[PDB]
């Protein structure tokens, strides 16, 4: 499935090149510009655990998730991953725990040492 495919066929987008965050672009977005640090970014997404369970989805909430890029308001993999996206892009990210919730996890839904899968759509970004 999609998690396996990004695990096996994704590109390492980390600065450390430690394969902690792997990406596949599913839909190419618009132009060349990506958001900048501090921008208000609007995304639709779903997240799955390695046991197949969907632990989060903005589509299911009928509202985008909104955050300021690069401020640690989201897991490291998102600050890194979303920063690589063009407006309109859809990508898959495979995030190892060191770029997600680590050994702590996030009660109740994210276990310790969890590798996470996301599909993310960048809807808009604004300074």
Positions annotated as catalytic residues are 45, 55-56, 75, 101, 118
Stretch that binds ligand NPO, among 3-11, 34-42, 73-81, 84-92 (CB under 6 A): 73-81
Which phi and psi angles does 20 have, rounded to 5°?
Answer: -75, -25
Interface with ligand NPO, residue 55, by CB under 6 A:
no
Q: What is the DSSP string of 13-58?
A: --SS-SSSEEEEEEE--SSS----TT-EEEEEEEEEETTS-EEEES
Stretch that binds ligand NPO, among 10-18, 31-39, 70-78, 82-90 (CB under 6 A): 70-78
Dist CA 91 CA 84 (whole Å): 10
Interface with ligand NPO, residue 74, by CB under 6 A:
yes
How many angstroms separate the Cα of 34 from the Cα of each of 29, 58, 96, 118? 10, 21, 23, 19
Q: At closest approach, how far in Å is the CB of 31 from ligand NPO?
A: 25
Interface with ligand NPO, residue 65, by CB under 6 A:
yes
Positions in the binding site for ligand NPO (CB under 6 A): 56, 65, 74-75, 78
């Amino acid at each position: 499935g999609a998690p396996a495919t990004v695990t096996e066929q994704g590109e390492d987008i980390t600065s450390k090149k430690d394969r902690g965050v792997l990406k596949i672009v599913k839909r190419v977005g618009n132009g060349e510009e990506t958001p900048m640090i501090g921008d208000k970014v609007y995304v639709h997404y779903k997240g799955k655990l390695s046991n197949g369970k969907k632990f989060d989805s903005s589509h299911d909430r009928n509202e985008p998730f909104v955050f300021s890029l690069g401020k640690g308001q989201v897991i490291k993999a998102w600050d890194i991953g979303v920063a690589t996206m063009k407006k309109g892009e859809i990508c898959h990210l495979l995030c190892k725990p060191e770029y997600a919730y680590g050994s702590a996890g996030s009660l109740p839904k994210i276990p310790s040492n969890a590798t996470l899968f996301f599909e993310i759509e960048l809807l808009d970004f604004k300074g």
